[PDB]
C-alpha cells in the first residue's frame, strides 16, 4: 500500500532523473559538434566527426527470387518481410553484411527523433517468445532488469548511444513492421540510392524516409 | 536539384604514409551522399586511391556568390559514347552556376542522349569577357541592343483558368 | 491486460505514463541571442569561393 506507493514514487523519480540525464547529454552532444566545426572553420582547420555505431536497415524487396546467399543474411538481420527494419551495430562486420544484400535493403544512420518515434509508436518487445507491445515500463524491466534498463527512455538511450547492452536490447526489439511509405518511393525504386533509386546506403535520408513509413 | 559541393578528403594515414595530401573537388550532386560517390569515382579512376583507405574531412555546399548577376559560363565536358571520348566544350548564359549545369544536363541528354554516369564534368568557368565568348547566339544575346517579341506567343497567358473546357469565345493570342 | 495499444506520441495520458519527464521538457531553448558571433576562416572563405 504505502510501501509500494513509496516504491512507485522513488522508482518514478529515478526514471525521470535518468531521462533528464540522457537528454542533457543529447543536447550537449549536438552543441559540441556545432562548436567543433565552428572552431575548426574559424581556424581554417578541417574537422571530421565521430563514426556511427548505429545503423537502421529497412528491407525493401520481397521474398520472391532472392539468392540463397542473400536469403540467409536477411534471416540473420531478421528482415523476414518487406518493409521490416531493425537496429544494427554499425561496425566492420556489418559493412559486408549490407554489401551482399546491398540491392535489397536501404540503410542509414538514425537521429534521435527517428529512434524515439519507432519505439514509442511501433515498440514491441520479444517477451517469452511473444510480440508484446511496450505499453508500460514494467514489461521492459521484467525483461531487461538485469542490464539496468528500466523504462523506454533507458531502452532508447541504450539504443541511441549504442551502449554495452546494445545487443541484448536490439535483440529484444521485435523487427519493426512498417507501412509502405506515404507518398511512395522514387519511380525506379530498385536502383541504388546514389544512382536515383532507393536501395542501399542512403545515409541520413533514412531519417527522411522513416517518417513516411509511420 | 543539384548543389555545388566542395569535397575535400585524403587517404587513411599509416606508418608508411603519415601525412596524406588533401585533395579538393568542386563537383555537383543532388545530395551529400551522391557527392561522395562521384568523388570516389572521379578520383579512383584517376589517382587510384582505394575506397576503404580513404576518409573525407569536409563536405561543404557553395551558394552562388552573386546569383542576381547575369553571367556566361564555359563548361568543358567529356562525352562518353560508343567511342567513349569526346572533348566537348559547351557554353551557357544564366544566373546560377548550378542552373547552367542543369541546362547542360538538359541539353546533353536531349541533343545527344547522354547519361549522368557517362558524362563527367571537366571544368566550369565564368566567361567575363564578350570577346572570350565564342558562340554567335550568345554573342548576339550579349549585344547592346537586344530586342525580340516574346516567343511562343501561345505560351504566354496560355488559357488561364482551372478547367476551361468549352471557352465561350475565341482566344486572341496576340 | 493491454486490450489496446494507445499511441504515446498522440495520447498525452499514455505519454506521461510511459515517460515521467515529458511533464517538464522545455523544448525551444533560448540559448543564443541577437548576438550571433559569425566565425568563418578567411582562408576557408577564399578556398570556398575558389575557381
Amino acid at each position: 500500500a504505502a510501501e509500494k506507493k513509496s516504491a512507485r514514487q522513488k522508482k518514478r523519480e529515478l526514471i525521470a532523473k535518468r531521462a533528464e540525464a540522457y537528454e542533457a547529454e543529447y543536447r550537449a552532444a549536438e552543441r559540441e559538434q556545432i562548436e567543433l566545426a565552428r572552431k575548426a572553420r574559424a581556424e581554417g582547420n578541417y574537422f571530421v566527426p565521430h563514426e556511427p555505431k548505429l545503423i537502421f536497415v529497412v528491407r525493401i524487396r520481397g521474398i520472391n527470387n532472392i539468392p540463397p546467399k542473400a536469403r540467409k543474411i536477411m534471416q540473420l538481420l531478421r528482415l523476414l518481410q518487406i518493409n521490416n527494419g531493425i537496429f544494427v551495430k554499425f561496425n566492420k562486420a556489418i559493412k559486408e553484411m549490407l554489401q551482399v544484400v546491398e540491392p535489397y535493403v536501404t540503410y542509414g544512420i538514425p537521429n534521435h527523433k527517428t529512434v524515439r518515434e519507432l519505439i514509442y509508436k511501433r515498440g514491441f518487445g520479444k517477451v517469452n517468445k511473444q510480440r508484446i507491445p511496450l505499453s508500460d515500463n514494467a514489461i521492459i524491466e521484467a525483461a531487461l532488469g538485469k542490464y539496468s534498463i528500466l523504462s523506454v527512455e533507458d531502452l532508447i538511450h541504450e539504443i541511441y548511444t549504442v551502449g554495452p547492452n546494445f545487443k541484448q536490447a536490439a535483440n529484444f526489439l521485435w523487427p519493426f513492421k512498417l507501412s509502405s511509405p506515404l507518398g511512395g518511393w522514387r519511380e525506379r525504386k530498385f536502383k541504388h540510392f546514389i544512382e536515383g533509386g532507393d536501395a542501399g546506403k542512403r545515409d541520413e535520408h533514412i531519417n527522411g524516409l522513416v517518417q513516411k513509413m509511420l | 536539384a543539384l548543389k555545388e559541393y566542395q569535397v575535400v578528403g585524403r587517404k587513411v594515414p599509416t606508418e608508411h604514409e603519415p601525412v596524406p595530401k588533401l585533395f579538393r573537388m568542386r563537383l555537383f550532386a543532388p545530395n551529400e551522399s551522391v557527392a561522395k560517390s562521384r568523388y570516389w569515382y572521379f578520383l579512383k579512376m584517376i589517382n587510384k586511391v582505394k575506397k576503404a583507405t580513404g576518409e573525407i574531412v569536409a563536405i561543404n555546399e557553395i551558394s552562388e556568390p552573386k546569383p542576381l548577376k547575369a553571367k556566361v559560363f564555359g563548361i568543358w565536358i567529356r562525352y562518353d559514347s560508343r567511342s567513349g571520348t569526346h572533348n566537348m566544350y559547351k557554353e551557357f548564359r544564366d544566373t546560377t552556376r548550378v542552373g547552367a549545369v542543369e541546362a547542360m544536363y538538359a541539353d546533353m541528354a536531349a541533343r545527344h542522349r547522354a547519361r549522368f554516369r557517362s558524362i563527367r564534368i571537366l571544368k566550369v568557368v565564368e566567361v567575363e569577357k564578350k570577346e572570350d565568348v565564342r558562340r554567335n547566339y550568345v554573342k548576339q544575346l550579349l549585344n547592346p541592343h537586344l530586342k525580340f517579341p516574346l516567343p511562343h506567343r501561345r505560351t504566354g497567358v496560355v488559357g488561364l483558368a482551372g478547367k476551361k473546357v468549352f471557352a465561350p469565345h475565341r482566344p486572341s493570342t496576340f | 491486460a493491454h486490450v489496446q495499444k494507445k499511441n504515446p506520441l498522440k495520447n498525452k495520458a499514455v505519454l506521461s505514463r510511459l515517460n515521467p519527464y515529458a511533464k517538464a521538457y522545455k523544448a525551444n531553448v533560448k540559448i543564443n541571442s541577437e548576438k550571433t558571433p559569425k566565425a568563418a576562416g578567411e582562408k576557408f572563405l577564399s578556398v570556398l569561393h575558389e575557381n
Binding site: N45, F47, V48 | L22, F23, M25, R78, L122 | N51
Partner: peptide, 19 residues
C-alpha cells in the same frame, strides 16, 4: 573511426580535375 583534426599547415589542398 574516431574524431580528429586534419591540420592543413604545409598540407594545403590544391583542386583536382579529371583528365
Amino acid at each position: 573511426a574516431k574524431a580528429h583534426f586534419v591540420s592543413t599547415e604545409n598540407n594545403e589542398p590544391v583542386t583536382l580535375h579529371p583528365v
